Amino acid sequence: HYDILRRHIRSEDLLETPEFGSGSRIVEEYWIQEPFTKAIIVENEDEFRNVYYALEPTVSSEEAEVISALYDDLKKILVLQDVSVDLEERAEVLVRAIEKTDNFYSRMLYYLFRDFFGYGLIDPLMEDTNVEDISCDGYNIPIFIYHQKYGNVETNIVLDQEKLDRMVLRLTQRSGKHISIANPIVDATLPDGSRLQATFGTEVTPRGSSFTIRKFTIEPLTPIDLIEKGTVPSGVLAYLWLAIEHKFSAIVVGETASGKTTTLNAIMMFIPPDAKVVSIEDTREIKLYHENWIAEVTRTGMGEGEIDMYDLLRAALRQRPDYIIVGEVRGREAQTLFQAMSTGHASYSTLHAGDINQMVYRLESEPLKVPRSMLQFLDIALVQTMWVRGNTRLRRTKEVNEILGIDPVDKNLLVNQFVKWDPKEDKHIEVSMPKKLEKMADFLGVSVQEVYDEMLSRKRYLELMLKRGIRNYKEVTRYIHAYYRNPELAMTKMEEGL
Amino acid sequence: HYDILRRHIRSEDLLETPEFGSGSRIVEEYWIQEPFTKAIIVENEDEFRNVYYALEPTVSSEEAEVISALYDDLKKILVLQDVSVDLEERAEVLVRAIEKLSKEYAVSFTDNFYSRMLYYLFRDFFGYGLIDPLMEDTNVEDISCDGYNIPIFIYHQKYGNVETNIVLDQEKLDRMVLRLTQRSGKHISIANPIVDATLPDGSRLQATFGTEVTPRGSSFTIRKFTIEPLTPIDLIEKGTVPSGVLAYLWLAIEHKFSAIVVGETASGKTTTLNAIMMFIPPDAKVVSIEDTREIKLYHENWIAEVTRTGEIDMYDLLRAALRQRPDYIIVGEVRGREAQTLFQAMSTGHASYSTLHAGDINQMVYRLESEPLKVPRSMLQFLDIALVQTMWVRGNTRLRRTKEVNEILGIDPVDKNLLVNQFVKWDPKEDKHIEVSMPKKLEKMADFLGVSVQEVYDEMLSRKRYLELMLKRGIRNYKEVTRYIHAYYRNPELAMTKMEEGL
Amino acid sequence: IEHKFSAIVVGETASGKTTTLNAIMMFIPPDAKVVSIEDTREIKLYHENWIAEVTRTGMGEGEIDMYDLLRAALRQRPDYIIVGEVRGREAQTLFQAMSTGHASYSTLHAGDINQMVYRLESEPLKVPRSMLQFLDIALVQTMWVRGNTRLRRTKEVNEILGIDPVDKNLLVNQFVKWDPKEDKHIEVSMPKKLEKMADFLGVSVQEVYDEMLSRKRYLELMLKRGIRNYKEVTRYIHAYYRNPELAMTKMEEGL
Ligand SMILES: Nc1ncnc2c1ncn2[C@@H]1O[C@H](COP(=O)(O)OP(=O)(O)NP(=O)(O)O)[C@@H](O)[C@H]1O
Ligand SMILES: Nc1ncnc2c1ncn2[C@@H]1O[C@H](COP(=O)(O)OP(=O)(O)NP(=O)(O)O)[C@@H](O)[C@H]1O
Ligand SMILES: Nc1ncnc2c1ncn2[C@@H]1O[C@H](COP(=O)(O)OP(=O)(O)NP(=O)(O)O)[C@@H](O)[C@H]1O
Ligand SMILES: [Mg+2]
């Protein structure tokens, strides 16, 4: 959208500078869509809070209706709104059509685009990858957002009745729905691939029409990342890399906000480049730099057929995939998962609990109701934690539990604890042997020492990526995919900064 | 409504002075809505009791007949009797229409009889008719009309149960019920004679039609809805909840502990929830789902969702809202299916709060676990606090009191019993709340912060002091209270100083 | 009854249950709002602020049972609730009403507190064991015959003290017992409930005990003066409620 534009423009010194009266300090400033929009994070000494200010090329009140006029005509051009047309061409017409200062030109095309190809009033928010949530509550209420770093902050964008009503139609339409007083609520998904709740009128929202947008922008923490944060030691990560390659199933358990999903997504970047993976989640959260992958998302059924995790797994496990990822088990679908395990599908997921005992309880009891005897097919179960002191915010893998199996005439769940985390020294201690490594020698058909050797090898590879500052997930997945293809060549490039 | 009327009034002094024979002595008088209505608590000393007298602008057998005459014509107009229309403009469609009928029939009334007839037309058109005065008087909390020819009884905020002078006969009462019923979107009739609805303003209605299931005639009962939200200060001042418990709750909702306030129907459950819901941190994202708009908050980043009875239910809205990233979710009252969903929101990290109809905590568990709600036992663990409201009655006094505060620790490993801790219990005897123990939830907070339990506790006392300072300074209204609380959030010490320093 | 202690009248068929209930229901405070739910009218009350609700058979319309009627009555948050006789599900709602402070009264077909407990706990009634604690008093009515000697007597006045943790459960203190050999009512324990009244009222026991003896005198006087009718009786009782002083004097001065 902006590359096609930003060239058709003439000037480059568009948009002036911000002017905030006293008590309105400027915390930070950064670009969004240079050189059009820029965002400024202002403070406000009185109310210890920061505020998000959305900057766009300032215009004249004469240029107002002027630009709103050039638009009143370009609107009656069906060949513009048509999405069937590639944006590259569509733009051209708008330009040519506009032919019928060398600075006012550019600082104008911006809008003409922001309203035909952009998202309008909220484009600055849709484009900024720091804003992961947009909340337009009601008529004449300043929009709020969730900043990647600032969190909840008020915004300089407000929409009066009509301005918002049309906004809600714009979003609703681009998402492919027809919100009306007859169907005032829409829970669809925008083209950019984002979750949009929307309400028209005031029948359900006395505070007027409204909308919310949860942007899938994430930037998933990486295995290397976990090593840096001291969350999981490099050696444990290698053990998992192997485990994951061999299809040992794992569940990440932990108190709410302790790290479960992050860790999962992190270690899910260890999946073999060619393996077919299918994921089922209630809402997108998992980012993977993997191709042969199908992502399935649950359906609310607000106004259609409700398709839950159970429905989605049952028909996915049917495509007989290699790896199966279930966002988090919160019910019935849990049975199907363990069934998938008993069958050899490398299955992974999350579970809200504090220790293996709670894990077992939740899994066995309704709603999950996973049969006691099925637990044997789970291989590893990690336990994540949050640890705090000063502003000391720590997320750690409290423990790496190896589920050995079931016992006949028992207590049942046989667990061998490999790694334990001591908080007193913030250290991970080996408190038993990694038995699973033995099951690998059996799979692979080699000796333990041999496997142990590869672990130490894979371990080195990770510590190197760390030293070389290879943090991003896209780049990390590339170097791991690398190692899978040819560990020899992979290792050498790593040691030779390439 | 009346400010509009007070405009066109065209005069004042429309009320005379009642004639209560001996064996009757005025105890107190007061405008309900001057210069039209006025309440006069009269003491029939022979029967040693009082008797609420709704006083309205006087009219003669001839006058009322004339009034009723205009009503018949004006009745033709639909606009003025249409709810979707702005009271203000249809209030003129009325005066501008009475102008017509007047000048046309070539007649000019008295400046007074106008500022009297006008009152009645607005009343029977826009207001609540015969019971409007009761529906207005801020002191009446309940209105109870037992049947044909039986005097309406009300509950006066100061005299409690009292006999009223307003009496509806069959013809009048049946209309009254149909009107109230219709006015609530619901329908009533001999086919289906019982109705449980809520009036446009929130007041809860319980009507009955004919003598079908209710001999003695049709009947109704209204439980008015206070327009101004009681605040945690109001609650400390009313002896309904200790400032300590309140401070405890402040921290709890700040730290996103999910809680449900339990109680009998009309025990003041919603009122408490709305009060403590003022402790929500300022920038957080609040989403509220209700069947009846009731909760009033001074919180900008909040979307108020409302049920559609036709069709959109709480369940739909709840699961919808849950696909976003709201910080706080308020339900108002879980009555069915969604109760499951609401307990999951808890499970997945959402600060969730709601009202529930039950008397004990035992009954809470039972009502939760069984149909229609059907919440699995393993899920209750995710509820943090459970308050219990009670409306204690002794003589001509009613006391809404937080009868008990419970903490849900967890689920016992044996028999999977709910681990609960009742740290505060009310005592009807001395009307004193008692701390049977210290909150165990304080440790969960300490960890979530990395501070010692001792450190959290002192923070509590601080907020507690802040609350009592606000009280002592007479800061009661919700907008201003919310304002001062949001402050303590932004900066505590600066907030404390300014409090004890008069600013 | 004034203090809202809930009571159930139990007894064999035709022993007097309903009569006794209706009788003692004439002790309800003149201004209190009372709602009654019955399968068929039987209760007569000389009370104004009262709503009488009657069940619907549904012969050709919508069937509305006692459950439906109570559930929406207890909703009007009344002072006193009267249920003709509990014969099922609606019994749960009643005891719920009790646990909540609604002075609730009703009848139950049974011969002794043991049968009462069984019937109430078991289906169709199925009232949860733990809820029984909210019932205050339970009277037991009887029929006694010899020659043409037709007698209806309150066999016993049982005070339900409460529940026991780790128990047998229903704690009952028997206040009065009826000896048929001499046709006399014997006190076989103290009226504990009078103590709960001192606590409610905020006075001493002796004080309450005094009022009892007072109210007792008032009744024996109405008797001596032949004030039998319910309309007239309810008037003199309503009287005493308004002003016991003035009430007592008129009584002693045949007016
Ligand atoms: N190891 C870590 N180091 C630093 N921050 C982390 C770490 N793990 C998670 N976080 C952050 O902590 C927050 C917690 O979310 P996350 O831990 O992903 O979900 P969760 O609590 O496990 N729940 P779920 O997503 O339902 O499984 C996110 O904002 C993460 O970015
Ligand atoms: N603490 C209080 N002090 C005085 N009046 C109160 C108090 N709390 C509530 N009320 C009033 O009591 C009535 C009860 O209202 P509310 O709390 O909304 O209902 P509820 O107990 O939730 N019952 P329901 O509406 O049946 O679910 C209202 O008229 C309130 O204004
Ligand atoms: N104390 C009494 N003295 C004389 N006759 C009585 C007395 N109590 C009841 N009766 C009469 O005995 C008959 C029994 O009816 P009643 O005792 O009212 O009902 P019940 O058997 O208790 N059943 P129910 O009405 O379903 O509770 C009636 O005709 C009454 O008039
Ligand atoms: Mg409520």
Please report the DSSP string for C186-228 in residue order. Answer: EE-S--THHHHHHHHHTS-HHHHHHHHHHHHHHHHHHHHTT--
- In 3-state terms, what secondary structure has residue B143? strand
| Cα separation, A280 vs A348, whole angstroms | 11
CATH class of B227-503: alpha beta
Are residues B486 and B254 in contact, defined by beta-carbon separation less than 8 angstroms?
no
Are residues B298 and B478 in contact, defined by beta-carbon separation less than 8 angstroms?
yes
Which atom, in ligand 2's list, is nearest to the CA of C75?
A: 26
| Cα separation, B380 vs B375, whole angstroms | 8
- Which string of DSSP letters, residue by residue, matches B239-304? TSS-HHHHHHHHHHHHTT--EEEEESTTSSHHHHHHHHGGGS-TTS-EEEEESS-------SSEEE
Domain boundaries, chain B: 1-226, 227-503
Q: Which of B298, B281, B283, B287 is nearest to B328 (CA)?
A: B287
Q: Which chains have 3+ CB pairs within 8 A of C?
A: B
Q: Which residue of B has its CA nearest to C54?
A: B213
- For A161, B279, B385, B472, C85, the CA distances from B272, given in Å and listed in that order, are 33, 12, 13, 21, 37
CATH class of A1-217: alpha beta
- Flag if C75 and B196 touch (Cβ within 8 Å): yes
| Cα separation, A470 vs A77, whole angstroms | 49
CB-based contacts of B442: which residues, under 8 Å, 6+ apart? B453, B456, B457, B460
- Flag if B378 and A389 touch (Cβ within 8 Å): no
CB pairs under 8 A between A and B: 115
Give φ, ψ of A326 to 5 degrees. Answer: -110, 110
Residue of A141, A214, A365 with shortest CB distance to B300: A141
Indicate the residue type of B117.
M
Indicate the residue type of B184.
S
Residue of B208, B221, B362 with shortest CB distance to C130: B362
- Which string of DSSP letters, residue by residue, matches B448-503? HHTS-HHHHHHHHHHHHHHHHHHHHTT--SHHHHHHHHHHHHH-HHHHHHHHHTT-
Indicate the residue type of B280.
I
Q: Which of B150, B149, B130, B116 is nearest to B13 (CA)?
A: B116
Domain A218-498 in CATH 3.30.450.40? The answer is no
Residue of B301, B323, B450 with shortest CB distance to A283: B323
C19 lines ligand 3 (CB under 6 A): yes
* Residue range B1-226, CATH number: 3.30.450.380
C169 lines ligand 3 (CB under 6 A): no
Query: Length of chain A, please?
Result: 498
Are residues A396 and A387 in contact, defined by beta-carbon separation less than 8 angstroms?
yes
Before B242, cis peptide (omega within 30)?
no
Q: Which of B158, B393, B240, B432 is nearest to C200 (CA)?
A: B393
Structure tokens at C38: 């019955």
- In 3-state terms, what secondary structure has residue A454? helix
**Which residues line ligand 2 at a C-beta cut-off of 6 Å?**
B 141, 204, 224-226, 230, 235, 238, 240, 263, 265-271, 333, 355, 400
- In 3-state terms, what secondary structure has residue A5? coil
| Cα separation, A243 vs A241, whole angstroms | 5
Rounded to whole angstroms, the maximal C-alpha distance in chain C is: 58
Residues of B in contact with C31 (CB under 8 A): 49, 153, 161-163
Taking the mean position of all CA atoms in its chain, how far away is CA A328?
15
- Ligand closest to C109 (CA) is 3
- Residue C107, annotated as binding a ligand: no
Structure tokens at A341: 């395990």
Are residues B54 and B153 in contact, defined by beta-carbon separation less than 8 angstroms?
no
* Contact status of C3 with chain B (Cβ, < 8 Å): no
Q: What angle do CA A287, A288, A289 make, to 5 degrees?
A: 130
| Cα separation, C31 vs B51, whole angstroms | 11
CB-based contacts of A163: which residues, under 8 Å, 6+ apart? A121
Annotated binding-site members of A for Mg(2+): 261
| Cα separation, B219 vs B169, whole angstroms | 11
Are residues A285 and A265 in contact, defined by beta-carbon separation less than 8 angstroms?
yes
Are residues A185 and B312 in contact, defined by beta-carbon separation less than 8 angstroms?
yes
Structure tokens at C175: 């206040």
Helices (H), B335-452: 338-347, 362-369, 441-449
**What CATH number did the domain enclosing C87 receive?**
3.40.50.300
- In 3-state terms, what secondary structure has residue C164? coil
Taking the mean position of all CA atoms in its chain, how far away is CA A259?
14
Q: Which of A305, A358, A312 is nearest to A333 (CA)?
A: A312
User: By residue range, what is the domain housing residue C97?
Assistant: 1-255
Resolution in A: 3.0
| Cα separation, C234 vs B425, whole angstroms | 40
CB-based contacts of B304: which residues, under 8 Å, 6+ apart? A205, A206, A207, B288, B290, B293, B295
- Flag if C56 and B360 touch (Cβ within 8 Å): no
* Contact status of C103 with chain B (Cβ, < 8 Å): no
| Cα separation, A211 vs B427, whole angstroms | 47
Q: Are strands A26-33 and A37-42 parallel, antiparallel or unpaired?
A: antiparallel
Q: State the DSSP H helix or E strand holding residue C178, giving kind and residue range, or none if neither.
A: strand C171-179
